[PDB]
């Protein structure tokens, strides 16, 4: 489905899958909530464990499944956007 960006708090992270406590999504028109993320065969990195905030990307496919792609570092509210 299509990629739409996606920031938050990691909740929890998981085998294949985990909870980040994401803002709203001006890509989604979402509300913040706790919601699980699927993570692809390649894994997770680190720096994105419970507790840090980071910057992802995810695709949302026709079903309403929520598939992470690429996530990176960010700092309280991401950063500055010109």
């Not at 309403?64 to 700092?75: D, I, K, R, Y």
Request: net charge positive; proline share 10%; glycine share 10%.
């Amino acid at each position: 489905g299509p990629e739409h960006r996606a920031v938050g708090r990691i909740q929890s992270i998981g085998e294949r899958s985990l909870i980040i406590a994401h803002e709203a999504i001006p890509s989604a028109q979402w509300g913040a909530m706790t919601m699980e993320f699927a993570a692809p065969p390649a894994g997770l990195p680190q720096g994105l464990k419970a507790g840090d905030r980071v910057a992802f990307s995810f695709r949302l496919d026709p079903h309403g499944m929520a598939t992470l792609v690429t996530v990176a570092p960010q700092v309280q509210t991401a950063g500055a956007k010109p």
